[PDB]
Design a protein around this ligand. Structure first.
Ligand SMILES: O=C1NCCN[C@@H]1CC1CCCCC1
Ligand SMILES: [Cl-]
Ligand SMILES: [Cl-]
Length: 163
């Protein structure tokens, strides 16, 4: 565990993370994909061997000894708000199980079901609150990665608000 488990946010490419493992915002088919998933495929392509997994699940594949946790959030273009909300919560619960099982002291994580799976809606608060619900009972240092300047400020505010 971390000596004083924390949450932090950085605005940069998650492929450059300084953590003991990474969460990929994966598609269900283990394809290279776009955005975070494409950055992850360029950096850790070996981790896409048998990485396909259903929506609302996470599947870890090692790139050497570096664990890549493929977490499949719902595409809100296809899911109802209700059913998508349930699957997004579930994906983060499976991430917390994997982080625990791996025994890492730190994890780099993106906000799932944002970007091209958002169905054109701002889901910062929805996705971040499901991340906290899952990760708050773990003792890993969590480092959230984002690309937008305004999102960085809002995520940082939400972290600082809880203290
Ligand atoms: O998921 C995102 N991350 C950074 C901001 N851009 C998208 C969400 C936007 C979709 C279109 C309408 C406005 C919100
Ligand atoms: Cl960068
Ligand atoms: Cl972002």
């Amino acid at each position: 565990g971390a000596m004083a488990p924390s949450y932090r946010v950085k605005r940069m490419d998650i492929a450059k993370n300084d953590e003991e493992c990474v969460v990929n915002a994966a598609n269900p088919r283990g394809l290279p994909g776009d955005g975070v998933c494409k950055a992850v495929y360029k950096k850790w392509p070996e981790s896409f061997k048998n990485s396909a997994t259903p929506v609302g699940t996470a599947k870890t594949v090692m790139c050497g000894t570096y664990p890549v946790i493929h977490a499949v959030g719902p595409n809100f273009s296809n899911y109802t708000e209700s059913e998508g909300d349930r699957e997004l919560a579930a994906a983060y619960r499976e991430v917390a199980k994997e982080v625990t099982r791996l025994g890492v002291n730190s994890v780099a994580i993106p906000l799932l079901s944002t970007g091209v799976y958002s169905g054109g809606k701002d889901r910062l608060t929805q996705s971040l609150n499901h991340l906290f619900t899952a990760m708050d009972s773990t003792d890993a240092d969590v480092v959230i990665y984002c690309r937008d300047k305004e999102w960085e400020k809002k995520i940082s505010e939400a972290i600082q608000m809880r203290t």
